[PDB]
């Protein structure tokens, strides 16, 4: 039944993926960013320079005011607003209508993006990280309780402006090739996973695997970059520098600040390494790996005809984040019902002429529990 939802995501590179929703009676139409790294459903509800439209509570007969305040500070950007409920639908989703919590955003700082074309956010993680506290039932929890939609969804994010699919309630088998590989959701707050091994161009980073998950590892469609803990970031960048030392880059390129540009079609893909992340498997001493190409972590940006890119691996102090750059080209199943996350090569996967992004296993990996922090 899922063909209806295929290709229901749009977006600009670096600006997230959104799906179309309606809120209120009569339905008000809004483009809503899909974020697996937060748990609040919130929409613009007041004029803003960057908003093309917004939720108008006064015009919805089914709007109910909860008369509680709310704010969410993300890793970057934040908003505050008023809690309420209203009827919500997803036109290119399941044919259902749910009464859901909505945060009507009244003030924001570094949240809305100039010309981004979305006006709100759909936090698909668990109640445990919802603001103001875990009693605000997240949207997807409301969907499963009030309807027959099965308790899972999948994300196919495609690279470059960009599009993809969010299959709500199941898995669409025409969206991926090969097998799905599953990793346990370590704890139901973020979508937390355990990275057990890291390789760059086949060479093991040889760190205590706890460093990869310090203090957590999450799968986050609302973050653009692969973000790494300080110690792991340094090892990775030192390794990517040595692999690409045939050319010289400003020390501000490795910090994500400056671009790098090449004459179009002359991007030296072969001098940047592939990165392999090994994730804990479903059986004892078993793992699998995802391999990332430079076409994923060198994110294309707008300028000439030179091809320009920003380095989309950045340093973190709140753990590893497998952002949109990692998820591009994979089909990712958020199997909440079975507390696991599946990866497979997407139908829109990233490959150059000599290397290919992959999802391969099984691997044997010893002492995987020691990798949790």
Ligand X SMILES: CCCc1cc(CNC[C@@H](O)[C@@H]2C[C@H](C)CCCCCCOCC(=O)N(C)[C@@H](C)C(=O)N2)n[nH]1
Q: Are 266 and 238 in contact (CB under 8 A)?
A: no
Task: Give the residue closest to ligand X by C-beta.
Answer: 37
35 flagged as catalytic: yes
Judged by CB under 6 A, the residue of 88, 100, 103, 129 near ligand X is 129
Q: Are 339 and 332 in contact (CB under 8 A)?
A: no
| Residue 189 touches ligand X, criterion: CB under 6 A | no
Is the C-alpha dihedral spanning 340, 343, 346, 350 positive or negative? positive
Binding mask 89-118 for ligand X (x = CB under 6 A): ----------------------x-------
Binding mask 10-39 for ligand X (x = CB under 6 A): -----xx----------------x-x-xx-
Q: Which of 35, 86, 141, 335 is catalytic?
A: 35
| Residue 138 touches ligand X, criterion: CB under 6 A | no
Closer residue to ligand X (CB): 129 or 209: 129
User: How many Å apart are CA 121 and CA 51, to the nearest integer?
Assistant: 13
Q: How far does Cα 178 stand from its chain's mean position?
A: 22
User: Residue 12's closest CA among 302, 348, 371?
Assistant: 302
> Which DSSP symbol is given to 222?
T
172 flagged as catalytic: no
User: How many Å apart are CA 278 and CA 358, to the nearest integer?
Assistant: 12
Part in contact with ligand X (CB under 6 A); list of ranges 99-107, 168-176, 215-223, 287-295:
215-223
User: How many Å apart are CA 178 and CA 11, to the nearest integer?
Assistant: 27
To ligand X, the closest distance from the beta carbon of 131 in angstroms equals 5
Q: Are 76 and 14 in contact (CB under 8 A)?
A: no
User: How many Å apart are CA 206 and CA 238, to the nearest integer?
Assistant: 13
Alpha-carbon torsion angle 233, 213, 286, 128, nearest 10: -140
The phi, psi pair for 40, rounded to 5°, reads -110, 135
Residues 223-282 that bind ligand X (CB under 6 A): 223-225
Q: Which of 86, 141, 220, 335 is catalytic?
A: 220
Closer residue to ligand X (CB): 36 or 287: 36
| Residue 131 touches ligand X, criterion: CB under 6 A | yes
To ligand X, the closest distance from the beta carbon of 222 in angstroms equals 3
| Residue 356 touches ligand X, criterion: CB under 6 A | no
| Residue 156 touches ligand X, criterion: CB under 6 A | no
Residues with active-site annotation = 35, 220
Binding site for ligand X (CB under 6 A): 15-16, 33, 35, 37-38, 72, 74-77, 111, 121, 129, 131, 220, 222-225
């Amino acid at each position: 039944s899922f063909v209806e939802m295929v290709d229901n995501l749009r977006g600009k590179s670096g600006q997230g993926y959104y799906v179309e929703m309606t809120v209120g009676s009569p339905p008000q139409t809004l483009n809503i960013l899909v974020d697996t790294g937060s748990s609040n459903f919130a929409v613009g509800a007041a004029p803003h320079p960057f908003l093309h439209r917004y939720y108008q509570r006064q015009l919805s007969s089914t709007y109910r005011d909860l008369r509680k305040g709310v704010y969410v500070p993300y890793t970057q950007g934040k908003w505050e607003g008023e809690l309420g409920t209203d009827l919500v639908s997803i036109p290119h989703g399941p044919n259902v209508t749910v009464r859901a919590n909505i945060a009507a955003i009244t003030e924001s700082d570094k949240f809305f993006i100039n010309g981004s074309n979305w006006e709100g956010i759909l936090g698909l993680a668990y109640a445990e990280i919802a603001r103001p506290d875990d009693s605000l039932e997240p949207f997807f929890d409301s969907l499963v309780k009030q309807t027959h939609v099965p308790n899972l969804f999948s994300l196919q994010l495609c690279g470059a402006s960009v599009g993809g699919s969010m299959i709500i309630g199941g898995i669409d088998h025409s969206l991926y090739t090969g097998s799905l590989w599953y990793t346990p959701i370590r704890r139901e707050w973020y979508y937390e996973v355990i990275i057990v091994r890291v390789e760059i161009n086949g060479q093991d980073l040889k760190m205590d695997c706890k460093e990869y998950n310090y203090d957590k590892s999450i799968v986050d469609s609302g973050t653009t970059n692969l973000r790494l803990p300080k110690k792991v970031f340094e090892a990775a960048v030192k390794s990517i520098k040595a692999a690409s030392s045939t050319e010289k880059f400003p020390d501000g390129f490795w910090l994500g600040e400056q671009l790098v540009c090449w004459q179009a079609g002359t991007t030296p893909w072969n001098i940047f390494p592939v990165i392999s992340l090994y994730l804990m498997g479903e059986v004892t001493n078993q793992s699998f790996r995802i391999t990332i190409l430079p076409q994923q972590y060198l994110r294309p940006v707008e300028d000439s005809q030179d091809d320009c890119y920003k380095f989309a691996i950045s340093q973190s102090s709140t753990g590893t984040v497998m952002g949109a750059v990692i998820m591009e080209g994979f089909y990712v199943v958020f199997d909440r019902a079975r507390k696991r996350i599946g990866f497979a090569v997407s139908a829109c996967h990233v490959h150059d002429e000599f290397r290919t992004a992959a999802v391969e296993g099984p691997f044997v990996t010893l002492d995987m529990e020691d990798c949790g922090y």
